[PDB]
Amino acid sequence: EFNILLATDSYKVTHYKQYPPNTSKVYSYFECREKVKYEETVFYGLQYILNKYLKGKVVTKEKIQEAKDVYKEHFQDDVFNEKGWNYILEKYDGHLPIEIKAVPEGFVIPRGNVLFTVENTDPECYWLTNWIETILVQSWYPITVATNSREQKKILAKYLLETSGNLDGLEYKLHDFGYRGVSSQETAGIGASAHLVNFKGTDTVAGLALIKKYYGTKDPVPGYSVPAAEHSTITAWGKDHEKDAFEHIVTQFSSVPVSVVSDSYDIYNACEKIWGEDLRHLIVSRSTQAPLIIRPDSGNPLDTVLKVLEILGKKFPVTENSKGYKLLPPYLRVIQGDGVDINTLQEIVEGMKQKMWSIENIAFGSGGGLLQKLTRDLLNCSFKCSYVVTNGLGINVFKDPVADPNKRSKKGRLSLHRTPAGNFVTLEEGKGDLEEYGQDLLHTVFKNGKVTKSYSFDEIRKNAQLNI
Amino acid sequence: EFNILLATDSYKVTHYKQYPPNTSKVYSYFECREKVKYEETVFYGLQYILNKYLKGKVVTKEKIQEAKDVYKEHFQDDVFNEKGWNYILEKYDGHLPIEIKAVPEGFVIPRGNVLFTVENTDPECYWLTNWIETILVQSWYPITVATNSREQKKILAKYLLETSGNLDGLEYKLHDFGYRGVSSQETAGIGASAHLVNFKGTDTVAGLALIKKYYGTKDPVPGYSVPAAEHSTITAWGKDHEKDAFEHIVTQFSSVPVSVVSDSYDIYNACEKIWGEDLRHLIVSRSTQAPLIIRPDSGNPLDTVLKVLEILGKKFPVTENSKGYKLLPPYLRVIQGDGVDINTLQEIVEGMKQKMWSIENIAFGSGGGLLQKLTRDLLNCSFKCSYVVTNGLGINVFKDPVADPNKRSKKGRLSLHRTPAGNFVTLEEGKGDLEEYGQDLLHTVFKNGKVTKSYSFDEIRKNAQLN
Ligand SMILES: COc1cc2c3c(c4ccc(O)cc4c2cc1OC)C[C@@H]1CCCN1C3
Ligand SMILES: COc1cc2c3c(c4ccc(O)cc4c2cc1OC)C[C@@H]1CCCN1C3
């Protein structure tokens, strides 16, 4: 049912009429333009797009007719290029005559570098390069989710290492709760998969299926969850029976970790009186492999975390780890899953450290902040034409708006290189062909309807690892 | 290839073990909780979800086995409720034993009112009400896009009325440019469909297909566009040939409206020297039905709009309308489609009014600001359990967190009524059954796998009209 002829910005339908006459090549590129800092970006998600939308026979006689009929009404005019699309159907069996070169998935690249390039492989299809901009520029989302997720991992690693002396359990310190808070089922899958580049905990089941279909893992699944209560399973017992709900849930899940939302009526009373006194005998009996994870879900996230830890530290036996930081017993942990984004995550771990609480005690859950409150503007994700051939001559093209030099685009044929210090540089104006900086790091990943280079999710996770 | 058994928050897989024993009924509701204020919301998008995801045979033996295999690995344990899902397959031929009642689509409802309710119709399926919360709560996105778009329409209507004395072309004053700035193809269609509740201009073609399939219009399409240049079609001509690019494009599109991005190198030079002198002869000759629409795309959105209008006003014949506001000639208009969201739109029309420019002169295009930069928290969209039947006894259920009184949920069986002054009131604790108000405004839209009541896009548009 997907029709690539109907998967572009409307105005692109009219572009074949606007290019200079005798244009044989249009060459475009994607970058996260330069200027939390977000100095480096995780390149993730293009392989999903190539496989789901671009590869194989994407043009049929029925798809051309459907698009002709929609655009006739949408524009109230006959501007649709049926001839160009028929050419692709008849000459290439509806395979796109396009070459895409990209940096490997999971690579961590500084801002302002070429990440992928797109060009037509047939001169008659000069107009196709920018037709597919809309579908390829959506790459911004998994790039931005993967990047923002990795930036939160860097904060958790710094504070976990300072307060505990190791990074054990780091991949489980940020759990994806974003399924309800995203705009669609398709978005849930894409965003959850991008989070699983960096972490292993997710409630967003749609992410597992996407990874298995488009990337692959050695392991049966790329992420995991544990049993957890919500407000409906506590509040269903009645206002006077919160203790009965808690006793039932921890007894049902006595041998596995279990998360219990504790703020239905009064989080402080739940921690001090219900967990800390009435049900304490059911908690101190649990295995190290099956902790109670208390989940506050309302109020000021920092103030609530600090008060919950002070409460639990007075009702349960607290130890002092080798770094001097307080540690709850191994059958008891906290997860803060409300109001968490990269800024509040920083504030909580810093406030915990100042009160001498180990980051071993806490994990975070993020919903909207992890998968929804991100824009194409956060990393200045941009797709621009840099090179055309018109009357057999290559010309270097760019924009350079007077009022915003940050929107200046790169000129000519691009390539990505290692510098002598081992950093990245993007060469412009075809200067990569001089091989003063060695070989281009971009690889052909799509050519003429075929995916030509692919990466497993395992390779992507290894590429995206923290420097440590 | 969608499997409703795999379309929930993972933890919901475990909830059938957490509810009180002898629970026969779980009843839950959606609202935009009370605290631009966004005092009223456009209810839009549930019918999409009911038809795409919830209706008909959604359970098969193969879907149950697939779910069982995934959950075994995801939890490293066998917690999946295979028996519950098998019961629905055998007893209802895989149709969901759920009743959903909703306010009519397009209705504009004040914050803090019930918009829809969900309950199981079979006692064995008490667990199913909140299993489908994840899919249903995503209704927040079309509600929020439709609501934010209508709030922008209110600002434009106010300023167009004060500066021009009428609302002609209001439905073409905010164009959807959001396709590349959203997170997915599916989000693009949903968001574009929500904008078309209020406006007619879109570049997001995916919205048209969604409206045709799930809602329907008397007109062949719900939304329109005009030819437009992008930086690629101007810059491809070369840095020294911007004039040649502009001339080619307006000549190819001489008899239709055409938008031309004019900031590739220098927006001010383009307006004053290229449009205003070198190509002025190809502009002043155009039909009122085929204006040149100049599109700045960089800089401070307010400062750039006001400077562009000042430039054009010195190069082209400006009139003064009956309200005393300046009006460009009919063959010349402007569209600002960079940095536009609800706050900047207000800043620009207010700044224009202060410089005595009519809002007739300007349209807005919005991308990320219109379809992407919105969260479930903006309208406090929430799905909560309000009523359960345990041991044959009905109990009013709710949350009331000590630290956030704004997160208090409603109690018991709910109903939506007209007040004697013609406002809306949500009645709690089954008090709607006393019939002290008129009829419940919630109608059954889904029952036992069937969509029971459908709205056309034309009725939705009429419900969402401005006062
Ligand atoms: C021993 O303490 C813990 C164990 C887990 C386990 C998982 C887990 C998944 C997501 C998440 O957000 C947290 C956790 C977790 C948290 C714990 O303590 C805070 C999944 C794995 C699959 C088999 C064994 N499971 C253990
Ligand atoms: C006469 O001036 C204008 C006309 C239009 C027309 C459309 C239009 C669509 C989207 C949009 O954002 C703007 C416009 C527009 C803007 C104009 O002036 C600024 C679509 C319709 C389909 C047949 C006739 N078209 C006219």
Author numbering:
A (entry chain B): 8 to 42, 52 to 484
B (entry chain A): 8 to 42, 52 to 483
The authors write:
As an important cofactor, NAD+ is involved in numerous life processes, including cellular energy metabolism, DNA transcription and repair, and redox homeostasis. Therefore, NAMPT is closely associated with tumor development.
In this study, we identified nicotinamide phosphoribosyl transferase (NAMPT) as the target of PF403 by using thermal proteome profiling (TPP). Moreover, microscale thermophoresis (MST), surface plasmon resonance (SPR), and isothermal titration calorimetry (ITC) experiments confirmed that NAMPT exhibits good affinity for PF403. Direct and indirect enzyme activity assays revealed that PF403 inhibited the catalytic activity of NAMPT, leading to a decrease in the concentration of nicotinamide adenine dinucleotide (NAD+) in U87 cells. Fortunately, we cultured and obtained a cocrystal of PF403 that is bound to NAMPT and found that PF403 binds to the rear channel of NAMPT active site. To explore the specific binding mode of the surrounding amino acids, we also performed an alanine scan and molecular dynamics simulation to identify potential key residues. These potential key amino acids were subsequently mutated, expressed, and purified through an E. coli system, followed by nanoDSF experiments. Our research has identified a promising lead as an NAMPT binding agent for treating gliomas and revealed the precise interaction mode of the NAMPT–PF403 complex by X-ray diffraction. These findings suggest that PF403 exerts antitumor activity by directly targeting NAMPT.
